[PDB]
Enzyme design. Structure first.
Site, PDB file in Angstrom:
ATOM      1  N   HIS A  68     -16.791 -12.308 -95.791  1.00  0.00           N
ATOM      2  CA  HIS A  68     -15.329 -12.048 -95.889  1.00  0.00           C
ATOM      3  C   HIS A  68     -14.604 -12.634 -94.673  1.00  0.00           C
ATOM      4  CE1 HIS A  68     -16.435  -9.137 -99.116  1.00  0.00           C
ATOM      5  NE2 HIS A  68     -15.295  -9.620 -99.617  1.00  0.00           N
ATOM      6  N   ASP A 107      -7.803 -11.379 -97.848  1.00  0.00           N
ATOM      7  CA  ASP A 107      -8.835 -10.539 -97.174  1.00  0.00           C
ATOM      8  C   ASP A 107      -8.587 -10.450 -95.656  1.00  0.00           C
ATOM      9  OD1 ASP A 107     -10.578  -9.476 -99.221  1.00  0.00           O
ATOM     10  OD2 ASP A 107     -11.679 -11.348 -99.318  1.00  0.00           O
ATOM     11  N   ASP A 217     -11.010 -15.407-106.451  1.00  0.00           N
ATOM     12  CA  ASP A 217     -11.748 -14.534-105.508  1.00  0.00           C
ATOM     13  C   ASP A 217     -13.250 -14.602-105.776  1.00  0.00           C
ATOM     14  OD1 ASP A 217     -12.049 -12.838-103.368  1.00  0.00           O
ATOM     15  OD2 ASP A 217     -11.425 -11.058-104.511  1.00  0.00           O
TER      16      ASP A 217
HETATM   17  C1  LIG Z   1     -22.907  -6.969-107.068  1.00  0.00           C
HETATM   18  C2  LIG Z   1     -22.050  -8.191-106.777  1.00  0.00           C
HETATM   19  C3  LIG Z   1     -22.677  -9.400-106.742  1.00  0.00           C
HETATM   20  C4  LIG Z   1     -21.903 -10.554-106.460  1.00  0.00           C
HETATM   21  O1  LIG Z   1     -22.390 -11.664-106.429  1.00  0.00           O
HETATM   22  C5  LIG Z   1     -20.464 -10.361-106.226  1.00  0.00           C
HETATM   23  C6  LIG Z   1     -19.545 -11.470-105.922  1.00  0.00           C
HETATM   24  C7  LIG Z   1     -19.637 -12.756-106.396  1.00  0.00           C
HETATM   25  C8  LIG Z   1     -18.548 -13.456-105.881  1.00  0.00           C
HETATM   26  N1  LIG Z   1     -17.840 -12.650-105.107  1.00  0.00           N
HETATM   27  N2  LIG Z   1     -18.432 -11.384-105.110  1.00  0.00           N
HETATM   28  C9  LIG Z   1     -17.953 -10.283-104.369  1.00  0.00           C
HETATM   29  C10 LIG Z   1     -16.815  -9.571-104.758  1.00  0.00           C
HETATM   30  C11 LIG Z   1     -16.349  -8.512-103.982  1.00  0.00           C
HETATM   31  C12 LIG Z   1     -17.004  -8.138-102.812  1.00  0.00           C
HETATM   32  C13 LIG Z   1     -18.136  -8.865-102.425  1.00  0.00           C
HETATM   33  C14 LIG Z   1     -18.612  -9.927-103.191  1.00  0.00           C
HETATM   34  N3  LIG Z   1     -19.972  -9.152-106.297  1.00  0.00           N
HETATM   35  N4  LIG Z   1     -20.696  -8.105-106.532  1.00  0.00           N
HETATM   36  C15 LIG Z   1     -19.942  -6.900-106.552  1.00  0.00           C
HETATM   37  C16 LIG Z   1     -19.002  -6.685-105.539  1.00  0.00           C
HETATM   38  C17 LIG Z   1     -18.215  -5.544-105.534  1.00  0.00           C
HETATM   39  C18 LIG Z   1     -18.329  -4.608-106.554  1.00  0.00           C
HETATM   40  C19 LIG Z   1     -19.245  -4.817-107.593  1.00  0.00           C
HETATM   41  O2  LIG Z   1     -19.367  -3.894-108.601  1.00  0.00           O
HETATM   42  C20 LIG Z   1     -18.447  -3.910-109.713  1.00  0.00           C
HETATM   43  F1  LIG Z   1     -17.642  -5.039-109.733  1.00  0.00           F
HETATM   44  F2  LIG Z   1     -19.169  -3.900-110.905  1.00  0.00           F
HETATM   45  F3  LIG Z   1     -17.596  -2.804-109.674  1.00  0.00           F
HETATM   46  C21 LIG Z   1     -20.042  -5.968-107.589  1.00  0.00           C
HETATM   47 MG   LIG Z   2     -10.903  -8.385-100.915  1.00  0.00          MG
HETATM   48 ZN   LIG Z   3     -11.928 -12.059-101.328  1.00  0.00          ZN
END
Ligand SMILES: Cc1cc(=O)c(-c2ccnn2-c2ccccc2)nn1-c1cccc(OC(F)(F)F)c1
Ligand SMILES: [Mg+2]
Ligand SMILES: [Zn+2]
Length: 313
Positions: A68, A107, A217
């Site tokens: 981030h 962010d 995002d």
């Molecule tokens: C587990 C997982 C694997 C990933 O590869 C990604 C990802 C790919 C690209 N960005 N990104 C990402 C997005 C937000 C923050 C950190 C990374 N995100 N998650 C992720 C993140 C937050 C909640 C979440 O549960 C939910 F969405 F199901 F609620 C899943």
């Molecule tokens: Mg964010």
């Molecule tokens: Zn972001």
């Protein structure tokens, strides 16, 4: 006035593509952002002195976290650039201005921890903002920087245009709260299928811009496989740090965040692609057909993760 940003030939050509990687040379990223503003909006929409000063203050307010960070900010802005350039006539002048800035700022001052961890820690921000905690903080940080002397890149907008663009930026940054994405896409899916979707309906545009923000995002899952695979390391480096901090509060973290359950990452990626990423880019492709390459690249990466599980890599 007549001062254009020009990139080397390979970057000049590849920046136009959805799967562009901004590269490991940090000192080129501000130039890459200005280039995208100039081509997406015009050489006139911002004063270069004010824009440059805004960019460097935004840079300074991103932290040295694994994912981030400043690179994520510029990466998300580039995906928005690619969507706007492939949908020329669908978006107003103010929208093109607002959305590139919103993505760059979305962010601001991220510490690498989820809304959930802030609430369980009982962080002050969780008392100030009960829902979309970090996202309300990101917008607050954006307004703070706009109000630094010589940093108001919108100064030459009328009073109503200024209130409109700050409204665009606020909604755009709030929409990056993935908790809000599920209900937003469901509503858009219903509206597209029943034929009620109207881009002249402000509340409908808002929903469409929210989905664009989720798409930009998450855009690491739309890159060539080597970029997607190496970005996943950075994403999981934060998850595991958060997992560690949960264990310190005497809470077993979900498997996603437990570095002991590293074996379960490949199946964790399948779930994310199937539950979040593929549905996001599918609905986006229905509303905005020229964004289809994001869906195709996402499908390719799902197939690569399936190959990882089947021990073929
Ligand atoms: C587990 C997982 C694997 C990933 O590869 C990604 C990802 C790919 C690209 N960005 N990104 C990402 C997005 C937000 C923050 C950190 C990374 N995100 N998650 C992720 C993140 C937050 C909640 C979440 O549960 C939910 F969405 F199901 F609620 C899943
Ligand atoms: Mg964010
Ligand atoms: Zn972001």
């Amino acid at each position: 006035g007549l001062m254009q940003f020009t990139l080397p030939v390979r970057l000049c050509k590849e920046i136009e593509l959805f799967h562009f990687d901004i590269g490991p040379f940090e000192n080129m990223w501000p130039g890459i952002f200005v280039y995208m503003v100039h081509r997406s909006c015009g050489t006139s929409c911002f004063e270069l002195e004010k824009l440059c000063r805004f960019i460097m203050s935004v840079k300074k307010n991103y932290r040295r976290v694994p994912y981030h960070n400043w690179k994520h900010a510029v990466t998300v802005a580039h995906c928005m650039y690619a969507i706007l350039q492939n949908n020329h006539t669908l978006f107003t002048d103010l929208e093109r201005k607002g959305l590139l800035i919103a993505c760059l700022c979305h962010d601001l001052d991220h510490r690498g921890f989820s809304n959930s961890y802030l609430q369980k820690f009982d962080h002050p921000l969780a008392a100030l903002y009960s829902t979309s905690t970090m996202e309300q903080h990101h917008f607050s940080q954006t307004v703070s920087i706009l109000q630094l002397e010589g940093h108001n890149i919108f100064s030459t907008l009328s009073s109503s245009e200024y209130e409109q663009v700050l409204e665009i930026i606020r909604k755009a940054i709030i929409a990056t709260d993935l908790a809000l994405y599920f209900g937003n896409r469901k509503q858009l899916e219903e509206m597209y299928q029943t034929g009620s979707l109207n881009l002249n309906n402000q509340s409908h545009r808002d929903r469409v811009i929210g989905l664009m923000m989720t798409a930009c995002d998450l855009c690491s899952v739309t890159k060539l496989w080597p970029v997607t695979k190496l970005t996943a390391n950075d994403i999981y480096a934060e998850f595991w740090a958060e997992g560690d901090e949960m264990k310190k509060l005497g809470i077993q973290p979900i498997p996603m965040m437990d570095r002991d359950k590293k074996d379960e990452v490949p199946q964790g990626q399948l779930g994310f692609y199937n539950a979040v990423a593929i549905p996001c880019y599918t609905t986006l492709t229905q509303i905005l057909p020229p964004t289809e390459p994001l869906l195709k690249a996402c499908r390719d990466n799902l197939s690569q993760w399936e190959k990882v599980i089947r021990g073929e890599e």
